[PDB]
Ligand binder design. Structure first.
Ligand SMILES: C/C=C\C=C\[C@@H]1O[C@](O)([C@H](CC)C(=O)NC/C=C/C=C(\C)[C@@H](OC)[C@@H](C)[C@@H]2O[C@H](/C=C/C=C/C=C(\C)C(=O)c3c(O)cc[nH]c3=O)[C@H](O)[C@@H]2O)[C@H](O)[C@H](O)C1(C)C
Ligand SMILES: Nc1nc2c(ncn2[C@@H]2O[C@H](COP(=O)(O)OP(=O)(O)O)[C@@H](O)[C@H]2O)c(=O)[nH]1
Ligand SMILES: [Mg+2]
Ligand SMILES: [Zn+2]
Lengths: 377, 144, 60, 208
RNA sequence: AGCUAGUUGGUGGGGUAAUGGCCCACCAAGGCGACGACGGGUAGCCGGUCUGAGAGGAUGGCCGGCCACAGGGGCACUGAGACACGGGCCCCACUCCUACGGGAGGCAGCAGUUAGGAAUCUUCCGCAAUGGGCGCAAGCCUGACGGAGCGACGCCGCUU
RNA sequence: UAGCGCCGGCCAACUCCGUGCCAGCAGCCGCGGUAAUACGGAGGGCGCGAGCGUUACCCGGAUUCACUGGGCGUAAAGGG
RNA sequence: GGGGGUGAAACGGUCUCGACAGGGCCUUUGGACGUGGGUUCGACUCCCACCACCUCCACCA
């Protein structure tokens, strides 16, 4: 099956506390949306969606960040029976750190425990919470419903069309809240090309494939790239297939979450944290200085000052490597607040460019935020 | 919980007059390796550059666990000695050809790597047999 | 044998064996090829590099 | 490929004057004059009694360096030389000379072979009508070495070819200095190429 | 260091295109072995190839010739020819479809994957040529083949 | 575009500093113990050149299985 | 990508006795128990996030 692009394409995930509905919901959207048109996907008349389904734990956060770094908007799933909880709160914060645009909301479990206030109380405290993080709390859409009941009835009749069931409809009140509100954004299909790698797997009788969201530019069956980073020396290759959701794409425009087939590589050469830059642009390095704003007790987490030794973890695109902070000479220490410029040396070499926004996370709480000044390695 | 280390090889080698016990500046990644006892004193005399003593040439295996963190085995590790004790050893060292040698290594009550130094006979001239015909003829040839 | 000055080989690292005894150390008959797998080239090295893993240091 | 670097450097060292540059390497500064000794921090100190190898080396190095031809080309040529019928200490020289770039030099055009080299590679020189940009093209008995039309009115083919007004050409060569033609009469012999080299030792260097 | 009973031979058969213990009855006790049989290990053989003053030694990758095999193993059918690489029957192993009763398959063709390893390539272009098969012919098929691709793997030429 | 090997002897190519049988080299002999042409860098030189070195394997050298072309009193080798 | 495992004694109480270094002859704080940081008046001990190994799962655009 050859993938044929028609409607604009957007990337959107679904985050929230555990057991609130995320997984079910996704199942929900999927069937509900598919009833109309003959990590998941769904076309909704106006648009075409790729739904990443954040499944992990406070142990699996090394994917939460990645998952969110993409998606031009996120569905915050909150249980009606329970209401905002720590993971419901934690994601929001990240959706904020990772810098996600617009956050739709879906109170789920409305089919259970009925209470006049409960729904309004909760709908009010969710907004409250968002507002506590600089998100359009009041302005943001909050759909009430039951993922299960929609999904359930969609199994009963996988043909159920909108208007034929109150539960299925609520899903549309969401798909709709997503069709409008969450805006499709700027792509940048006119720059070089580059794509971080999120997952590398071997397709039998074909070879290695690398997936991720095309950062900038495009890629076509027959072009040439250079897997850069995390490897002793960059590898130059040629692509032999651009696929999207098991469908044959002809040209991978930016913003596309796609799988790229790398001719000749062995699954050990590729990883998660490299990039498929087009030759010439980008090059591995391990040293640089940069402007880094350091969040205070108030946010992120650092509540004391850090010296030069510090070996925080630096998150670039899809991965994160530990690095050493070579404070400039004549500074001596940084403290919560202020934007300091300092030199750092990553133990592992990673693709870098002039202005690359990266973050600093240590001890489980984001301690800093910054852009790359100059490359020295 | 580390066994008493020892320089059996030079305890006999040089005559021992006075002794001195001092703590060292261990890297810890090293303190591990010392507790495992994997370290020898072969070819290691202790001196002091400037006014501080530094046990030099002491080999402390790397810590497998420690990965990239460990420092090189032969390092100019620094020792800790009372100021009046340090000057007495300098008086003897600068003035005459007496060495300071690692006599052994262990951990005291408190549990710190504590090295035991010794007073050295020194001397021990290393006989070097010489002049190989080959060279001799060789030079004659060229010079003239 | 592990050539050069300094190494990064652990009690379980992946190495590539070359072949060359060491008239000095008894039953030692193979040199470890520096610069392959876990065996790292020689830091700071600048002379006979080809035979010590280390790549050409840019004259910075 | 072909050395490319301090040549009036090999002039000395070898100690027996070289002229890969032509004019300068001909004037009162062939580098030799002022520095008849070999290069380096040393260069002028008791030069230890050379060894039987050092000699064979220096001889072949001498001769070779006297063309630019890199070892592979040189040596590869010597081999074939050996094979062929007749003495080799001559035939090896017979071929070292049929080398177009050399012939083109032996016959003016360039105040040196290095300058005879850049002269072929750039299509300037020709052979029997059609051009040849192959320094390695071994010249046969008869094939004249005429210049080009875009090459003549050149500020440099002038000067060079104006050093012909008077001076004679190799005993196995002719020279219509007007149409810049001239042929290749016959295969040169040991004397005609009274070179500062003892071909024998070069036959031996290539044994051990 | 001894080996052998279809073993060696004989008469008559069976079989094949044809000789023959190739197979079978029957008769005889034979056959081979230090000039190395039997057994073990290794191995496809040659033209050549590398080396060597040579006589020798080492090798058999590419290209040509012969042999053997086609997942392991047995068998025949068809046919001028096969006991048949992309034909068939059967057992075995393994993977795949199933409505669980039986189906489909074999890359040591080309290209490609994975495993193993120090290490070995494009899911390509064309039947224009040469060669083949079928056909009166036009023509069809030909991953033979003619080419392009990737790798300093090698040789020769070339540049800075 | 210019790289790579080597510079104690065999083997073509030498000096300063660093280290002080340590760190290290290494094909053989062997270097390293406080002026190291042998270790590390630099300067310089040599060889070679889009290549240069290493490793493995074959022949050579090896008349060291000798037919060409060896030996056996004491070197291995005369059978009690 | 995750889970688990190993980073000294089934162990909350000083300080390398000491020299270097910043305040207050003697007190003292730092440094050294893989690295980076937290929490304590105070950690080798206790949380965290890294590192290197080990081990068990996951993984076909
Ligand atoms: C942070 C993880 C990964 C980041 C990855 C990279 O980040 C980026 O580098 C990014 C570039 C700016 C980056 O540097 N991110 C890195 C940083 C980004 C920081 C931005 C935006 C800030 O503004 C200064 C923003 C969060 C800010 O905080 C405020 C709120 C703070 C709340 C703190 C916690 C509170 C109360 C709390 O109760 C709380 C809790 O949540 C957990 C535990 N216990 C708690 O008690 C407010 O909501 C503001 O909005 C790029 O986006 C890259 O492309 C990237 C996405 C790959
Ligand atoms: N009562 C009720 N339960 C639901 C509804 N949707 C999902 N659930 C239940 O919520 C539990 C967790 O759902 P899940 O999708 O795994 O949430 P996740 O933790 O975000 O993945 C499951 O047992 C679902 O059956 C709903 O609409 N109503
Ligand atoms: Mg889930
Ligand atoms: Zn000159």
């Amino acid at each position: 099956g050859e993938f044929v692009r028609t409607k604009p394409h957007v990337n959107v995930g679904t985050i929230g506390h555990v057991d609130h509905g995320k997984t079910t919901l996704t199942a929900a959207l999927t069937y509900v949306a598919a009833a109309e048109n003959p990590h998941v996907e769904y076309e909704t008349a106006k648009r075409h969606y790729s739904h990443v389904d954040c499944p992990g734990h406070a142990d699996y956060i090394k994917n939460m960040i990645t998952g969110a770094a993409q998606m031009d908007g996120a569905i915050l799933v909150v249980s009606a029976a329970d209401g905002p909880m720590p993971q419901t709160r934690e994601h929001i914060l990240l959706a904020r750190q990772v810098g996600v645009p617009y956050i739709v909301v879906f109170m789920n479990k409305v089919d259970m425990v009925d209470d006049p206030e409960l729904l309004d109380l909760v709908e009010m405290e969710v907004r409250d919470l968002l507002n506590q993080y600089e998100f359009p709390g009041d302005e943001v859409p909050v759909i009430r419903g039951s993922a299960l009941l929609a999904l359930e009835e969609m199994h009963k009749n996988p043909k159920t069309k909108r208007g034929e069931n109150e539960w299925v409809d609520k899903i549309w009140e969401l798909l709709d809240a997503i069709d409008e509100y969450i805006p499709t954004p700027v792509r940048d299909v006119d720059k070089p090309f580059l794509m971080p790698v999120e997952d590398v797997f071997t397709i039998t009788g074909r070879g290695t494939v690398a997936t991720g969201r095309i950062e900038r530019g495009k890629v076509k069956v027959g072009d040439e790239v250079e897997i850069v980073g995390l490897a002793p020396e960059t590898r130059k290759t040629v692509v032999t297939g651009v696929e999207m959701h098991r469908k044959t794409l002809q040209e991978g425009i930016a913003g596309d979450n796609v799988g790229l087939l790398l001719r000749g590589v062995s699954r050990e050469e590729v990883e998660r944290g490299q990039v498929l830059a087009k030759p010439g642009s980008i090059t591995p390095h391990t040293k640089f200085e940069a402007s880094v704003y350091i969040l205070k007790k108030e946010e992120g987490g650092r509540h004391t000052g850090f010296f030069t030794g510090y070996r925080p973890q630096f998150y670039f695109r899809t991965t994160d490597v530990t690095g050493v902070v070579r404070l400039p000479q004549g500074v001596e220490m940084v403290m919560p607040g202020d934007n300091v410029t300092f030199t750092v040396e990553l133990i592992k070499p990673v693709a870098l460019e002039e202005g690359l926004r990266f973050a600093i996370r240590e001890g489980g709480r984001t301690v800093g935020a910054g852009v790359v000044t100059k490359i020295l390695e | 919980m580390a066994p008493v280390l020892e320089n059996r090889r030079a305890r006999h080698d040089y005559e021992i007059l006075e002794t001195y016990e001092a703590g060292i500046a261990l890297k810890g990644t090293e303190v591990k390796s010392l507790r495992a006892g994997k370290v020898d004193f072969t070819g290691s005399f202790a001196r002091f550059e400037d006014g501080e003593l530094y046990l030099e040439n002491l080999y402390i295996a790397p810590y497998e666990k420690g990965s990239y963190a460990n420092v090189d085995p032969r390092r100019k590790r620094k020792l800790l000695l009372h100021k009046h004790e340090l000057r007495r050893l300098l008086g003897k060292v600068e003035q005459k050809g007496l060495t300071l040698v690692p006599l052994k290594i262990y951990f005291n009550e408190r549990g710190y790597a504590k090295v035991l130094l010794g007073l050295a006979r020194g001397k021990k001239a290393y006989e070097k047999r010489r002049e190989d015909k080959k060279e001799a003829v060789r030079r004659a040839l060229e010079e003239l | 044998y592990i050539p050069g000055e300094g190494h990064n080989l652990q009690e379980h690292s992946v190495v590539l064996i070359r072949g060359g005894r060491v008239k000095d150390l008894p039953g030692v008959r193979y040199h470890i090829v520096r610069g392959v797998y876990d065996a790292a080239g020689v830091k700071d090295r600048k002379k006979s590099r080809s035979k010590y893993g280390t790549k050409k240091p840019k004259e910075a | 490929g072909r050395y490319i670097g301090p040549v009036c450097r090999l002039c000395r060292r070898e100690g027996v004057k070289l002229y890969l540059k032509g004019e300068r390497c001909y004037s009162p500064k062939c580098a030799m004059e002022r520095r008849p000794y070999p290069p380096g921090q040393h260069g002028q100190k008791r030069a230890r009694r050379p060894s039987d190898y050092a000699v064979r080396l220096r001889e072949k190095q001498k001769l070779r360096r006297i063309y630019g031809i890199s070892e592979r080309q040189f040596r590869n040529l010597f081999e074939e030389a050996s094979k062929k019928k007749g003495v080799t200490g001559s035939v090896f020289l017979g071929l070292l000379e049929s080398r177009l770039d050399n012939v083109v030099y032996r016959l003016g055009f360039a105040v040196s072979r290095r300058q005879a080299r850049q002269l072929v590679r750039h299509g300037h020189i020709t052979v029997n009508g059609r051009r040849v940009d192959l320094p390695s093209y071994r010249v046969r008995p008869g094939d004249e070495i005429a210049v080009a039309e875009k090459s003549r009115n050149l500020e440099l083919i002038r000067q060079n070819l104006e050093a012909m007004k008077g001076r004679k050409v190799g005993p196995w060569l002719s020279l219509d200095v007007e149409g810049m033609k001239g042929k290749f009469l016959r295969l040169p012999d040991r004397e005609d190429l009274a070179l500062p080299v003892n071909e024998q030792l070069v036959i031996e260097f290539y044994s051990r």
